[PDB]
Amino acid sequence: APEPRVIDREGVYEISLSPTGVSRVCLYPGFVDVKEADWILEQLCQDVPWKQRTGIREDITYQQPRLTAWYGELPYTYSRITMEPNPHWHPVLRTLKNRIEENTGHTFNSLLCNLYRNEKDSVDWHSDDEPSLGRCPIIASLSFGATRTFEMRKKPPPEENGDYTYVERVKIPLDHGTLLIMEGATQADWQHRVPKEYHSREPRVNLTFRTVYP
Numbered sequence: 635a636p637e638p639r640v641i642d643r644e645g646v647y648e649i650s651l652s653p654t655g656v657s658r659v660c661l662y663p664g665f666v667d668v669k670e671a672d673w674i675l676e677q678l679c680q681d682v683p684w685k686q687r688t689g690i691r692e693d694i695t696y697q698q699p700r701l702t703a704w705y706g707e708l709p710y711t712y713s714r715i716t717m718e719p720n721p722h723w724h725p726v727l728r729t730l731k732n733r734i735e736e737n738t739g740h741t742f743n744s745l746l747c748n749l750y751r752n753e754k755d756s757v758d759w760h761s762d763d764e765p766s767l768g769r770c771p772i773i774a775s776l777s778f779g780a781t782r783t784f785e786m787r788k789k790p791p792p793e794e795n796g797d798y799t800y801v802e803r804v805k806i807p808l809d810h811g812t813l814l815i816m817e818g819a820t821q822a823d824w825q826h827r828v829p830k831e832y833h834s835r836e837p838r839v840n841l842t843f844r845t846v847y848p
């Protein structure tokens with residue numbers, strides 16, 4: 635089994651060129667300085683209306699191993715009743731939205747907040763390929779609190795018979811205040827997850843900004 639590549643330096647990485655196109659990730663460690671990130675984490679922990687929700691795999695439901703809240707536009711196929719998106723952005727979240735946009739040149743209209751309570755909270759392998767994100771969505775990820783690992787694995791071609799054993803893999807540590815951008819063919823050609831850990835972890839808040847189209 636090949637060895638996962640590690641991305642942990644500020645930079646811009648074309649992680650693949652095919653089959654759909656160039657998949658690109660950009661890493662910005664310390665996008666938010668630690669002390670400001672400490673204050674932001676406090677605010678979001680006190681104010682975001684975190685709730686336990688269910689997810690779907692294979693038309694069966696389950697309690698997601700994370701708490702969530704939504705702001706702005708919601709992907710068309712999700713349930714507004716279940717996800718309860720707030721069209722009025724928390725002022726702190728609005729600031730971070732504006733700061734990402736001013737520093738990267740990308741716009742967003744949707745925010746998913748994820749609270750990983752501890753080392754047993756996680757998100758399983760997936761792509762951000764909801765239809766209303768379009769082909770090649772630009773997705774910005776901002777992390778606060780405990781470091782957790784963002785893993786990626788390349789979607790195998792058909793001749794691989796659905797085996798992920800030998801696909802290319804990337805590992806990215808996401809620490810306090812780090813911004814990560816995915817763009818290009820990344821949702822098309824890759825999956826990603828945040829795995830559970832077998833060692834004590836304090837809380838982590840992740841902000842995933844996206845653009846939902848009508």
Ligand SMILES: O=C(O)CCC(=O)C(=O)O
Nearest residue numbers: 746748775784828840842
């Ligand atoms: O928390 C992370 O960094 C990943 C979150 C994610 O993949 C999602 O919100 O769909």
Ligand SMILES: [Cl-]
Nearest residue numbers: 699756757758
């Ligand atoms: Cl999950």
Ligand SMILES: [Mn+2]
Nearest residue numbers: 760761762826
């Ligand atoms: Mn995702």
